[model samples]
Target: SNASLQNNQPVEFNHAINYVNKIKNRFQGQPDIYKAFLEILHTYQKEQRNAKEAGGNYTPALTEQEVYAQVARLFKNQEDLLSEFGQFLPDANS
Candidate 1:
């Protein structure tokens, strides 16, 4: 869950990045898209950190569903991209 970090568990950023790197070769010629995906994950990580620092009860800046929704929009035009690489994307249902 997005709350994992708030609960003091290891952040998922590294896990997410590892998934991205696993498919790095598959995104050949689409360096910008790859970079954008990483940037989004990085931004989410920063937001989580910021929220944790603010004290009080922590809430995620973006829910898992929201994160995927944004990612879906980012890759909307490329159905083939989703078809091939979507599994690596975070599973909101999990």
Candidate 2:
């Protein structure tokens, strides 16, 4: 039971954190937007877990096409933001 509990624990958003780090500098002066993005990613991850648990086959909540479409939209919005306000933050990669 303990092992199952540990195994079923909500997944951490470490990967998302790493991704956020990669683009943090590109989103300078928009901490609110950054926070919102992280929240959205975490919620998506949760939804994925819930779907897998409910579907006996562990199917994903979003289809591959849908995921890509959402990602495309996010990138487009990010591009627009960057175009309006130049990146001023220090490199997040370093």
Candidate 3:
């Protein structure tokens, strides 16, 4: 009971510490776009890892262009999302 929980505590703590360190490293190097850069890097890293895991050409088969396309699509979706009542009201000031 207690022993099992105690044994796993170090592993959990280490993971959390490592995550914080990684985030800090990302932020320190890219202060202007810390979150966004980190997100992209993490996604790319995951895709690469998955690609390697699946016999180097299976599962997550995300190429550089694919990644760019995914990111572009994400932005396009954000831009296309309609706000309630905002679409109907035209900007007369502009």
Number of the top lDDT candidate: 1
- TM-score of candidate 2 on Cα atoms, chains taken together: 0.46
Residues 32-71 of candidate 1 have per-residue lDDT tens digits of 8778877888888987887788782687777666767777
Q: Model 2: per-residue lDDT, tens digit, 1-94?
A: 3655655423234533445565676667877756665665676688788887887476666664554445445555556443322222223533
Give the runs in model 2 whose Cα sits over 4 Å from its true position. Answer: 1-18, 55-60, 77-94
lDDT of each: 0.66, 0.55, 0.52
**Candidate 3 weakest ten by summed lDDT:** 79-88
Clashes of each: 0, 0, 0
Instruction: Write the residue-wise lDDT of candidate 3 on 1-94 in tens digits.
Output: 3665644557556755665565455345555444654476588899888888877757675666665545444333333221211222335534
TM-score of each: 0.55, 0.46, 0.34
Q: What ranges in model 3 sit over 4 Å off?
A: 1-32, 59-61, 69-94
